[PDB]
């Protein structure tokens, strides 16, 4: 109680503003893929181009996460938030000027800018929660921050199909709809960036928590990211957890990117239904994350719960694979909901397991490695599954995903640890 601790209303504002612009970023990640056929027709490109529009996020994250983490640690929260918001706004504005049949590269540049923004955006939740919220409010603030990005992904799934119908016959109408969507996104991003500039302060006048007061009082300490990574790789259980988490997240990313292709293969004129399926998957994933966190809290064992969740995710993936072609959209809805539930439920559990197993290694390095593995696996799975679907049909790529999930289960079982919640 020696230092003075107080809570300011501005924290909520900050938690809102980030949760908004981060949301927007997530939207921009999946806007193209969900209507990938429409953009393919408009730009006269192949589906691989639209897949790369989504994979640029993953590609940009891998080489910039560690530099971004260092910048956040050294310069503070405000600079990172401003960078993320401004980059997202600039990417949206560039996309606004990319609405033409011969200007795909402008949209690619805007998407790359949004990808660079994501690197700054993704790391802010926990740091903001610690800096601006008290001990009891930290968990809720972090949950809201992550839910912002998840809701952004869900909205990116749902909205573009409604906003941009597949009017390939009329180029003017398609261009007008794409321009409307881009201008709306740009306006929202600009407003959020202005709000971040005006109100997003570095930290409150007084620390919200005693732990935050101690952290701020402590002098800065330099950390060697390379040494931390080398020590982490020595931990074979952590390597196995990294591989499994990357496999699962990459499978989710590949399914999200190629969902439109799989749905359009068997159901025609169902882009809106595909977006609804994606939104159902994301919402079920949120619910599964909450329920799996509760299950882990009750049972208190990382290994058993993680393995069971992985097995359930594999079963759901197989069910979706072998039910997609039944030509019933409701079955696709249910299977996608179950699959997203289990897949997104796995992610927090695996992340916590990897963070705890790596102790006392810095959480930043482990988080960066986990996310980089997720991005790499997502890129590889997206490429392989897209090629398989184009050449042999969605079932081949889905079976490839199922095989990778089975390999992930095998790796998870091989993990040797008795770690328990403390
Ligand atoms: C600044 C950071 C975020 C990195 C940004 C990198 C991108 C500008 C690069 C990385 C991978 C590239 C893609 C890698 C492979 C392809 C497939 C390629 O396909 C063809 O040329 C097919 C031609 C045919 O149809 O015969 C077209 C370019 C494209 C989309 C590339 C476009 C430019 C990309 C997205
Ligand atoms: C498990 C599979 C699927 C993914 C494995 C990924 C790693 C092997 C790669 C991915 C990103 C890489 C990092 C990307 C950027 C940098 C910054 C780079 O900075 C420097 O050159 C200076 C470092 C210093 O200050 O000592 C050092 C290597 C490092 C940490 C890299 C180390 C190796 C990493 C973690
Ligand atoms: C850990 C990594 C290295 C695993 C890689 C596994 C791939 C080599 C497998 C996984 C899914 C397989 C595909 C699943 C389904 C099919 C459909 C299949 O269709 C056919 O024409 C033959 C069967 C039939 O008659 O229906 C042809 C092989 C193919 C593309 C398979 C080719 C081999 C794939 C890509």
Query: What is the first-to-last residue Cα distance?
Result: 25 Å
Architecture of the largest domain in CATH?
Up-down Bundle
Radius of gyration: 21 Å
- Secondary-structure element order, N to C: HHHHHHHHHHHHHHHH
Largest sheet: none
Helix fraction by DSSP (H/I, runs of at least 4): over 70%
Query: How much strand?
Result: under 5%
Bound molecules: cholesterol hemisuccinate
CATH superfamily of the largest domain: MFS general substrate transporter like domains
Named CATH topology of the largest domain: Growth Hormone, Chain: A
Give the count of structural domains. 2
Instruction: List the total number of helices.
Output: 16
Report the CATH C-level class of the largest domain: Mainly Alpha
Shape: globular
Binding site for ethanolamine: 118, 375
Keywords: Cell membrane, Disease variant, Epilepsy, Erythrocyte maturation, Glycoprotein, Intellectual disability, Membrane, Mitochondrion, Neurodegeneration, Neuropathy, Phosphoprotein, Receptor, Retinitis pigmentosa, Transmembrane, Transmembrane helix, Transport
GO biological process, one term: heme transport
Protein name: Choline/ethanolamine transporter FLVCR1
């Amino acid at each position: 109680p020696l230092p003075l601790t107080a809570l300011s209303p501005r924290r909520f504002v900050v938690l809102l503003i980030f949760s908004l612009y981060s949301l927007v970023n997530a939207f921009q990640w999946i806007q193209y893929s969900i209507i990938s056929n429409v953009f393919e027709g408009f730009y006269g490109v192949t589906l691989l181009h639209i897949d790369w529009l989504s994979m640029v996020y993953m590609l940009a994250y891998v080489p910039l996460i560690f530099p971004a983490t260092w910048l956040l640690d050294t310069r503070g929260l405000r600079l990172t938030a401003l960078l993320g918001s401004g980059l997202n706004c600039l990417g949206a504005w560039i996309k606004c000027g990319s609405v033409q049949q011969h200007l795909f590269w402008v949209t690619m540049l805007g998407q790359c800018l949004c990808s660079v923004a994501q690197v700054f955006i993704l790391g802010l939740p926990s740091r903001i929660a610690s800096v601006w919220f008290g001990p009891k409010e930290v968990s809720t603030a972090c949950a809201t921050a992550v839910l912002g990005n998840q809701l952004g992904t869900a909205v990116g799934f749902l909205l573009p199909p409604v906003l941009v119908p597949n009017t390939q016959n009329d180029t003017n109408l398609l261009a007008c709809n794409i321009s409307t969507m881009f201008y709306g996104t740009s306006a929202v991003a600009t407003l959020l960036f202005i709000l971040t500039a005006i109100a997003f302060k570095e930290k409150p006048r007084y620390p919200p928590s005693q732990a935050q007061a101690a952290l701020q009082d402590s002098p800065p300490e330099e950390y060697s990211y390379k040494k931390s990574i080398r020590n982490l790789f020595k931990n074979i259980p952590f390597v196995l957890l990294l591989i499994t988490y990357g496999i699962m997240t990459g499978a989710f990313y590949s399914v999200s990117t190629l969902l439109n292709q799989m749905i359009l293969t068997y159901y025609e004129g169902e882009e809106v239904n595909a977006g609804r399926i994606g939104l159902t998957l994301v919402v079920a994933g949120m619910v599964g994350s909450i329920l799996c966190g509760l299950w882990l809290d009750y049972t208190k064992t990382y290994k058993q719960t993680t393995l069971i969740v992985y097995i359930l995710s594999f079963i759901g993936m197989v069910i979706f694979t072998f039910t997609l072609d039944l030509r019933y959209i409701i079955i696709v809805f249910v299977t996608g909901g179950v699959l997203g539930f289990f897949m997104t439920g796995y992610l927090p559990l695996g992340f916590e397991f990897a963070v705890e197993i790596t102790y006392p290694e810095s959480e930043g390095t482990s988080s960066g490695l986990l996310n980089a593995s997720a991005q790499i696996f997502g890129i590889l799975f997206t490429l392989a599954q897209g090629k398989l679907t184009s050449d042999y049909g969605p079932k081949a790529g889905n079976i490839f995903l199922c095989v990778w999930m089975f390999i992930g289960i095998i790796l998870t079982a091989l993990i040797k640890s008795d770690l328990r919640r403390h």
